[PDB]
Symmetry: C2
Subunit: 172 residues, 2 copies
């Protein structure tokens, strides 16, 4: 249950640069548990905006913040999996969307996006590595060059190399 | 298998008064199919932002827009069930959040909100009727009076009548 309502970020975890932000942990059996208790926000003296699962220990890490939360920071670790609550990941764009990090992965024509890491069915030069920070993960619509047209993605349709995504303006 | 990722509006449906946008429909067994089809956006020439399930006729109505989409009006029908994709329901607030219609239902202390229609554990005068338009449904955080403090809600904790909710500003 409810684990699928979060945005996964493999081999990741966070770091509180601010010693003031609260945290809470526990050791369970599956990440699903972590999800479940976060969705229900039960037993957490704050709003569970995100949680990490440490497969190594088998421990959850509920936070009142997520990767975009200032005073926090991302970091690699093979035993860590980041799960952010979608309600706290901005789902509208301001202007062009250079910073859009939502999880929409469909072109305005309804085509499923192609993973950025993939070269099939379209070979391209937009790799995360060569575009750190623009979050070119999974197959989420992004706009790594902040070009007019806002967020787009390479489509899984061989006949359509790319297309923009229908992502609303916060303005309305 | 995904219906819970949609913000349900019982006995409701949208009218597309503007033959500029299409509407893909299809006789199905359960509403769940509709959801999956809409989630996985499979076989849809657009971005599925909402879908209505015709209990009676047993058919899905996938729309490339939602209740907030300029160009549509919603109505009552015992046989209808409106499911809006959360991805397209602005989840950040502007200012006081007088129009917030997200689905956050947890306080800043992590307390589960009390349904607005309920008078327990807290008796109150906030009725959908009294505040039609403010969308006082389920137990979502709201700011019906556009007060200073942003969205809030009566808590399910008897010892805590109400509390504000931690809902992010679009300009953050």
């Amino acid at each position: 249950n409810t684990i699928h309502e979060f945005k996964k970020s493999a081999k990741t975890t966070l770091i509180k640069i601010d010693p003031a932000l609260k945290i809470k942990t526990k050791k369970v059996n599956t990440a699903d548990q972590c999800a479940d208790r976060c969705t229900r926000n039960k037993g957490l003296p704050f709003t569970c905006k995100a949680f990490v699962f440490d497969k190594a220990r088998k421990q959850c890490l509920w936070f009142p913040f997520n990767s975009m939360s200032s005073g926090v920071k991302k970091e690699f670790g093979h035993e860590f999996d980041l799960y952010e609550n979608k309600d706290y990941i901005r789902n509208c764009i301001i202007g062009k969307g250079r910073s859009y990090k939502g999880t929409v992965s469909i072109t305005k024509s309804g085509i499923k996006c192609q993973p950025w890491s993939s070269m099939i069915p379209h070979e391209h030069s937009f790799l995360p590595s060569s575009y750190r920070g623009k979050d070119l993960q999974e197959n989420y619509c992004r706009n790594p060059r902040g070009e007019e047209g806002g967020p787009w993605c390479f489509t899984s349709n061989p006949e359509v190399r790319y297309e923009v995504c229908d992502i609303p303006q916060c303005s309305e």
